Design a protein around this ligand. Structure first.
Ligand SMILES: Nc1ncnc2c1ncn2[C@@H]1O[C@H](COP(=O)(O)OP(=O)(O)CP(=O)(O)O)[C@@H](O)[C@H]1O
Ligand SMILES: Nc1ncnc2c1ncn2[C@@H]1O[C@H](COP(=O)(O)OP(=O)(O)CP(=O)(O)O)[C@@H](O)[C@H]1O
Ligand SMILES: [Mg+2]
Ligand SMILES: [Mg+2]
Lengths: 279, 276
C-alpha cells in the first residue's frame, strides 16, 4: 500500500518570509492558502542540487513518524524548488538550552521527555527496513513543536544502511551504525548541563584531536550538578554512549529500556507545568 | 514519490488491553516491542473493509488526522495500528461532566478550529475525501487536547443520525461533513447531548426533516459564549435544510481565524492543565 507526497505550487505559499539561512539553502516561513496552516519551506540558496532536495523529501516522506518532522508536501517547479514541512513554533533544542535569558528555567521533566523522544525517533529510523541512519544529529537539527515535543529534522546526511560542527561526531569518523548513538550521548550531556560541549576549545581541530585521544566533555559537579534526577544512570548512559569503541556503545533499544523506568517517575502533569513555565 | 505503510506482526504488540468494544470490531491499546511506543489497535474480532480505512488514513495523513502506524495483515489476525490518543474522544470530554467540570472556551475554540482544519484538508485533497461519519466519538484528543480525526469507515472519495443531514436519510453529497460539523459546533459550545428532550431516535429523524435543529436558546448557548453571534451564524449556515446554503470549510476557517486570534496561547495551556 503506497502513499503519494502532495505537490504544492509556489503560488499557494503566501506570506513567504525569510526565517533561517544556512550554507547551500534557505528556510522560510509561510502559510498555505488552501489548507490554512502555517508551514515552513526549505529551498536552495542548479542541476545536481535538485536531486539532493528530492532525496531529503523522499526520506522524510518514508521516515514519517511521531518524532520525525512531518513533511506536508513538495514544491517542485522550474521557477522554485523546496520542501514543505510543518512549522515548528519553538525552533530548535539548541536555542532552548542556550538562550538562558529567554529561558532561565527548563524543568527536569521536560529535559527528560526531550531526551526520551529523540531516542524514540532515532530508534524508529534504525528500525526501518532498510535501517536509516540520521548521521547529522545535533541540537540545531532537533526541533520543538507548539507543545515542546521533539521533531527530528535535517536528513541531508542520513544514509540508508544495506561538515561544520564536529562536536557530535565520533572519532572513527574523522555507513557506521554507532555514529548516531555517539551524537545522542553528546546531546544528552548538553541537555542536562546546558553547557556547550568543549567551551574552552577555540579550534575544532583541538577538539578533533582531544576527542580521538579519548577525551570527552567534562563530567563533574559543575557540569552535571548532584541534584540532577537519576544522575548516576544518566552519566552511565552518557559514558557508554560516547565510548571510544563503537561496539561498547549501546543500541537505541537498550538506551530506551534504560530510559523508560526513569521517565515513569515524573507525574504526567509535571511535563505540562514545565512547558507553561516557559510561556 | 511514494511511502509504504509497514506491516506490524501481532507478536510485536505487548500489553494488549481492551479499550472500547464496537459493533464492527474491537479496539485495544498496546505497546510496540521494537518502536517502544504506545499504540491503538482496531481489529476485525471483511478484509477489504479494514484495508480500505487503512489505505485512506495512510493517504489522508495530515496534522489533524489520526496517524496510522501500520497494519496487521496476518492469517490469524487483521487490524489497524495508530498512535494512541491518551485523552480519548471529544464526546467523552464534552459529556463526562463529573470528571471534566470545566472546559475553558479557548480550548473548545481550538478544537473546533482544528476539526475544521482537518476536514478542510480532506476536501482539499485530489480527489477530495469526504468523511461522512463525523461525530464527537470520532474526534480524538492527543496529550495536549489537539485534534485527530478518526474512523474513515464510512469515508468516500469524490471520484446516531444526529450528525447526518436530512437528505441523506434515504440513500451522494458533498455537504454531509459541513452539516455534521455544525452539530458538533453546537455540541461543543453547549455541552448538551443534541436532541436531549427526544427519546425516540426516529422522532428526531422526523423533526429534522421538518427543519428542526437542537435547542438554540440561551439555556443551551449563553451570551457569555465568546463571539456567540458569529458562532451561531456558523452553526446555522452549516446545518441548513437546504444543502446549497451550507458553506465550505475554507469559508468557515476564514470566519474562524479572527475568533481564534482573540485568545492568547497561555490560555490553551492553562485550559489543558485545568483538565489534568
Ligand atoms: N519547520 C520548522 N520550523 C521552524 N524552524 C525550522 C523549521 N525547519 C527548519 N527550521 C530552522 O532551520 C534550521 C536548520 O534547518 P534544517 O536543519 O532543516 O536545514 P539545514 O541546516 O540542513 C540547511 P542546508 O542543508 O541548506 O545547509 C533549524 O535550526 C531551524 O531553526
Ligand atoms: N488511537 C486511539 N487512541 C485512543 N482511543 C482510541 C483510538 N482509536 C480509537 N479509540 C477509541 O475507540 C473509539 C473510536 O474507534 P473507531 O472510530 O476507530 O472505531 P469504530 O467506531 O469504527 C468501531 P465500530 O465500527 O465497531 O463501532 C473512540 O471512542 C476511542 O475511545
Ligand atoms: Mg540543519
Ligand atoms: Mg467511530
Amino acid at each position: 500500500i503506497c502513499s503519494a507526497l502532495p505537490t504544492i505550487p509556489y503560488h499557494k505559499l503566501a506570506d513567504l518570509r525569510y526565517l533561517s539561512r544556512g550554507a547551500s539553502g534557505t528556510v522560510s516561513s509561510a502559510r498555505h492558502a488552501d489548507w490554512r496552516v502555517q508551514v515552513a519551506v526549505k529551498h536552495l540558496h542548479l542541476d545536481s542540487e535538485r536531486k539532493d532536495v528530492l532525496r531529503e523529501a523522499e526520506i522524510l516522506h518514508k521516515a514519517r513518524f511521531s518524532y520525525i518532522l512531518p513533511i506536508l508536501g513538495i514544491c517542485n517547479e522550474p521557477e522554485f524548488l523546496g520542501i514543505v514541512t510543518e512549522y515548528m513554533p519553538n525552533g530548535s533544542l539548541n536555542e532552548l538550552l542556550h538562550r538562558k535569558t529567554e529561558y532561565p528555567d527548563v524543568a527536569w521533566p521536560l529535559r527528560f521527555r526531550i531526551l526520551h523522544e529523540i531516542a524514540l525517533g532515532v530508534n524508529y529510523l534504525h528500525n526501518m527496513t532498510p535501517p536509516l541512519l540520521h548521521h547529522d544529529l545535533k541540537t540545531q537539527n532537533i526541533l520543538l513543536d507548539n507543545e515542546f515535543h521533539v521533531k527530528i529534522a535535517d536528513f541531508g546526511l542520513s544514509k540508508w544502511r544495506m561538515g561544520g560542527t564536529i562536536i557530535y561526531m565520533p572519532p572513527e569518523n574523522y555507513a557506521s551504525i554507532k555514529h548516531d548513538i555517539y551524537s545522542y550521548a553528546v546531546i544528552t550531556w548538553e541537555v542536562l548541563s546546558r553547557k556547550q560541549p568543549f567551551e574552552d576549545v577555540t579550534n575544532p581541530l583541538q577538539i578533533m584531536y582531544s576527542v580521538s585521544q579519548g577525551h570527552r566533555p567534562v563530567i563533574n559537579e559543575e557540569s552535571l550538578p548532584y541534584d540532577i534526577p537519576h544522575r548516576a544512570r544518566m552519566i552511565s548512559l552518557i559514558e557508554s554512549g560516547w565510548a571510544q569503541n563503537p561496539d561498547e556503545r549501546p543500541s537505541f533499544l537498550k538506551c530506551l529500556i534504560e530510559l523508560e523506568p526513569v521517565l515513569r517517575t515524573f507525574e504526567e502533569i509535571t511535563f505540562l507545568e514545565a512547558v507553561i513555565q516557559l510561556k
